[PDB]
Protein backbone atom coordinates (compact mmCIF):
# COMPACT_ATOMS: atom_id res chain seq x y z
CA UNK A 1 0.00 0.00 0.00
CA UNK A 2 0.90 3.67 -0.06
CA UNK A 3 3.19 4.57 2.82
CA UNK A 4 3.59 8.11 4.13
CA UNK A 5 6.85 8.92 5.92
CA UNK A 6 5.99 11.65 8.42
CA UNK A 7 8.47 13.34 10.77
CA UNK A 8 7.45 15.20 13.94
CA UNK A 9 9.92 17.98 14.88
CA UNK A 10 10.10 20.80 17.41
CA UNK A 11 11.77 22.15 20.56
CA UNK A 12 12.10 20.08 23.77
CA UNK A 13 8.84 19.41 25.61
CA UNK A 14 6.43 20.92 23.06
CA UNK A 15 4.48 17.65 22.88
CA UNK A 16 5.93 15.80 19.88
CA UNK A 17 5.45 12.44 21.61
CA UNK A 18 2.10 13.24 23.23
CA UNK A 19 0.66 14.05 19.79
CA UNK A 20 2.02 10.84 18.26
CA UNK A 21 0.86 8.64 21.16
CA UNK A 22 -2.63 10.15 21.09
CA UNK A 23 -2.85 9.31 17.38
CA UNK A 24 -1.47 5.77 17.65
CA UNK A 25 -2.55 4.55 21.10
CA UNK A 26 -5.48 6.83 21.96
CA UNK A 27 -4.17 8.12 25.29
CA UNK A 28 -2.45 11.18 26.76
CA UNK A 29 0.96 10.77 28.36
CA UNK A 30 1.30 13.09 31.36
CA UNK A 31 5.01 12.25 31.46
CA UNK A 32 10.94 6.42 18.24
CA UNK A 33 9.15 5.33 15.07
CA UNK A 34 5.55 4.14 14.83
CA UNK A 35 3.85 2.21 12.03
CA UNK A 36 0.07 2.03 11.76
CA UNK A 37 -2.37 0.99 9.03
CA UNK A 38 -5.15 3.55 8.68
CA UNK A 39 -7.80 4.58 6.16
CA UNK A 40 -7.74 8.28 5.24
CA UNK A 41 -10.45 9.56 2.86
CA UNK A 42 -11.06 6.03 1.70
CA UNK A 43 -7.42 5.31 0.93
CA UNK A 44 -5.87 2.40 2.78
CA UNK A 45 -2.37 3.45 3.78
CA UNK A 46 0.43 3.11 6.29
CA UNK A 47 1.58 5.99 8.48
CA UNK A 48 5.29 5.59 9.24
CA UNK A 49 5.93 8.29 11.82
CA UNK A 50 9.25 9.37 13.28
CA UNK A 51 8.92 11.00 16.68
CA UNK A 52 12.24 12.85 16.96
CA UNK A 53 14.34 13.64 20.04
CA UNK A 54 14.04 17.16 21.43
CA UNK A 55 17.78 17.71 21.71
CA UNK A 56 20.37 16.55 19.20
CA UNK A 57 23.75 18.26 19.26
CA UNK A 58 23.64 17.16 15.65
CA UNK A 59 21.97 18.97 12.77
CA UNK A 60 23.88 16.28 10.89
CA UNK A 61 22.05 13.83 13.13
CA UNK A 62 18.88 15.54 11.88
CA UNK A 63 19.97 15.55 8.22
CA UNK A 64 19.54 11.78 8.10
CA UNK A 65 15.85 11.71 9.04
CA UNK A 66 14.91 14.95 7.27
CA UNK A 67 16.30 13.45 4.06
CA UNK A 68 13.87 10.52 4.05
CA UNK A 69 10.78 12.21 5.51
CA UNK A 70 8.06 13.15 3.02
CA UNK A 71 6.15 15.55 5.25
CA UNK A 72 6.87 17.30 8.53
CA UNK A 73 4.82 18.29 11.55
CA UNK A 74 6.56 21.37 12.91
CA UNK A 75 5.34 21.62 16.48
CA UNK A 76 5.56 24.46 18.98
CA UNK A 77 3.73 25.03 22.26
CA UNK A 78 1.43 28.06 22.62
CA UNK A 79 2.72 28.72 26.14
CA UNK A 80 6.35 28.67 24.99
CA UNK A 81 7.59 31.66 22.97
CA UNK A 82 11.08 30.19 22.47
CA UNK A 83 9.59 27.07 20.85
CA UNK A 84 7.64 29.27 18.39
CA UNK A 85 10.71 31.29 17.47
CA UNK A 86 12.69 28.07 16.94
CA UNK A 87 10.28 27.01 14.17
CA UNK A 88 12.30 29.07 11.68
CA UNK A 89 15.52 27.14 12.34
CA UNK A 90 13.75 23.79 11.81
CA UNK A 91 12.09 24.91 8.56
CA UNK A 92 15.32 26.29 7.11
CA UNK A 93 17.13 23.02 7.93
CA UNK A 94 14.38 20.97 6.27
CA UNK A 95 14.57 23.14 3.15
CA UNK A 96 18.37 22.90 3.15
CA UNK A 97 18.46 19.08 3.25
CA UNK A 98 15.52 18.50 0.87
CA UNK A 99 16.81 21.06 -1.66
CA UNK A 100 13.35 22.61 -1.84
CA UNK A 101 11.49 25.79 -1.00
CA UNK A 102 8.29 23.71 -0.95
CA UNK A 103 8.15 20.64 1.31
CA UNK A 104 4.89 19.21 2.69
CA UNK A 105 4.63 20.69 6.16
CA UNK A 106 2.04 21.69 8.77
CA UNK A 107 2.59 24.26 11.53
CA UNK A 108 1.12 22.94 14.78
CA UNK A 109 0.44 25.05 17.85
CA UNK A 110 0.13 22.46 20.62
CA UNK A 111 -1.16 22.64 24.23
CA UNK A 112 -4.14 24.79 23.22
CA UNK A 113 -5.98 23.58 26.33
CA UNK A 114 -3.79 25.87 28.46
CA UNK A 115 -5.09 29.34 29.43
CA UNK A 116 -1.64 30.81 29.97
CA UNK A 117 -0.76 31.25 26.30
CA UNK A 118 2.15 33.42 25.19
CA UNK A 119 1.93 32.95 21.42
CA UNK A 120 -1.23 34.42 19.84
CA UNK A 121 -3.11 32.46 17.19
CA UNK A 122 -2.89 35.42 14.78
CA UNK A 123 0.90 35.45 15.24
CA UNK A 124 1.26 31.80 14.26
CA UNK A 125 -1.38 32.16 11.55
CA UNK A 126 0.54 34.92 9.79
CA UNK A 127 3.83 33.00 9.99
CA UNK A 128 2.16 29.96 8.42
CA UNK A 129 0.76 32.26 5.70
CA UNK A 130 4.26 33.52 4.90
CA UNK A 131 5.50 29.94 4.57
CA UNK A 132 2.43 29.03 2.56
CA UNK A 133 1.60 26.15 4.89
CA UNK A 134 -1.49 25.31 7.01
CA UNK A 135 -1.68 26.21 10.71
CA UNK A 136 -3.56 23.89 13.08
CA UNK A 137 -3.88 24.17 16.87
CA UNK A 138 -3.88 20.94 18.84
CA UNK A 139 -4.16 19.53 22.31
CA UNK A 140 -2.68 16.10 22.91
CA UNK A 141 -4.54 16.32 26.24
CA UNK A 142 -8.08 16.71 24.88
CA UNK A 143 -7.29 15.22 21.45
CA UNK A 144 -8.54 18.39 19.74
CA UNK A 145 -7.01 18.79 16.30
CA UNK A 146 -4.78 15.69 16.53
CA UNK A 147 -6.23 13.70 13.59
CA UNK A 148 -6.71 17.00 11.79
CA UNK A 149 -2.98 17.79 11.97
CA UNK A 150 -1.75 14.40 10.76
CA UNK A 151 -4.45 13.96 8.09
CA UNK A 152 -3.89 17.47 6.73
CA UNK A 153 -0.19 16.61 6.39
CA UNK A 154 -1.05 13.44 4.46
CA UNK A 155 -3.24 15.52 2.14
CA UNK A 156 -0.38 17.98 1.60
CA UNK A 157 1.88 15.12 0.50
CA UNK A 158 -0.88 13.80 -1.80
CA UNK A 159 -0.98 17.27 -3.40
CA UNK A 160 2.77 17.83 -3.77
Ligand X SMILES: Nc1nc2c(ncn2[C@@H]2O[C@H](COP(=O)(O)OP(=O)(O)NP(=O)(O)Nc3ccc(C(=O)c4ccccc4)cc3N)[C@@H](O)[C@H]2O)c(=O)[nH]1
Judged by CB under 5 A, the residue of 17, 20, 80, 110 near Mg ion is: 17
How far apart (Å, rounded) are the C-alpha atoms in residues 49 and 38?
A: 12
Radius of gyration of the chain (CA): 15
Nearer Cβ to ligand X (46/114): 114
Residue 98 near residue 66, CB atoms below 8 Å: yes
Helix (H) or strand (E) holding 18: helix 16-25
Q: Which does 79 bind (CB under 5 to 8 A by kind): Mg ion, ligand X, none?
A: none
φ, ψ for residue 142 (rounded to 5)?
-100, -10
Say if residue 14 carries a ligand binding annotation: yes
Per-state percent for the chain, helix, strand, coil, to nearest 5: 35, 25, 40
Binding mask 85-114 toward ligand X (x if CB under 6 A, else -) reads -------------------------xx-xx
Site size for ligand X (CB under 6 A): 20
17 binds ligand X (CB under 6 A): yes
Say if residue 26 carries a ligand binding annotation: no
Q: Could you tell me which residues are annotated as the binding site for GTP?
A: 13-18, 29-31, 53-54, 110-113, 139-141
- Interface with ligand X by CB under 6 A: which residues? 10, 12-18, 29-31, 53-54, 110-111, 113-114, 139-141
Amino acid sequence: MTEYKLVVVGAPGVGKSALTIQLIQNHFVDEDSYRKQVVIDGETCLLDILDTAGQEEYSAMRDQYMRTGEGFLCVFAINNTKSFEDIHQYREQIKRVKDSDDVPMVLVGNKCDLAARTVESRQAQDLARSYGIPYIETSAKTRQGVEDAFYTLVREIRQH
